[PDB]
């Protein structure tokens, strides 16, 4: 009954069965393209967008990572700047994954419930008099919900095993909590950005880890650091957690 919903960077969405060693159930490509895009003409040294829209700057010659004064959305509030922001929802059957409806800003088509919403923010850079694009930055992310000073937490456990994502391996891994040794795994063709475990209605986001290595040692992430990943020659940043494995 349970599902493991995972959002890769190719824009696609897959479901895995955590009750059969992570067998793949179905795929879902909404056709909105990949999650990060960047066209360019002539230097501006390297602009690295994040999935929330925040852009970052790496200077090649001094080999340094800097922030950027504008985020993808701030360009929407030398060049004229076009584009737009988008949030489309996709309603899927809780089990089968058949699309029950897709509702966009454009319209609503129709054919428990898994609710998927894809955010997508694109910004092109157009020459003022020309009308030709000189660069662009398209960026998106997924988010999942189920439809039948204080901080919290939650762990992604299931049948005496816990499930975790290694973000540098793009792998969804399940470990027996007693012993910590690996139980099953699944690797994706495309880096993983977000993952959720759907169990008994409640949905769980699976934190993504970068294994600096069962006596497992997870840690936070500094002051204002950013984790670096690559999708088919395109770079981006996420929110992974540190993790070391010992014996």
């Amino acid at each position: 009954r349970s599902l493991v919903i995972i959002s890769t960077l190719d824009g696609r969405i897959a479901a895995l069965d955590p009750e059969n060693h992570g067998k793949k159930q179905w795929d879902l490509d909404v056709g909105s393209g990949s999650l990060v895009s960047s066209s360019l003409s002539k230097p501006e040294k390297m602009i690295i967008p994040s999935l929330d829209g925040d852009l970052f700057q790496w200077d090649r010659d001094r080999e340094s990572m800097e922030t950027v004064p504008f985020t993808v959305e701030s360009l929407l509030e030398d060049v004229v700047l076009v584009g737009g922001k988008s949030l489309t929802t996709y309603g899927l059957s809780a089990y089968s994954g058949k699309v029950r409806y897709i509702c966009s800003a454009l319209g609503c088509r129709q054919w428990d419930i898994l609710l998927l919403q894809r955010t997508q923010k694109t910004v092109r850079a157009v020459g003022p008099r020309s009308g030709n694009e000189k660069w662009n930055f398209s960026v998106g992310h997924f988010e999942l919900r189920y439809i039948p000073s204080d901080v919290e937490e939650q762990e992604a456990v299931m049948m005496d095993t816990v499930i975790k994502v290694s973000v540098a391996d793009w792998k969804v891994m399940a470990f027996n909590k007693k012993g910590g040794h690996l139980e099953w795994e699944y690797q994706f063709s495309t880096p993983i950005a977000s993952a959720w475990l759907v169990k008994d209605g409640k949905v769980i986001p699976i934190s993504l880890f970068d294994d600096t290595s069962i006596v497992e040692a997870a840690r936070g992430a500094t002051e204002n650091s950013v984790y670096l990943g690559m999708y088919r020659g395109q770079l981006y940043l996420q929110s992974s957690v540190r993790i070391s494995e010992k014996f």
């Binding site: 090649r60 990572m65 500094t222 950013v226 984790y227 992974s240």
Partner: peptide
Amino acid sequence: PQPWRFYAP
């Protein structure tokens, strides 16, 4: 640039 690590200024 670099590989698959965190970084900062």
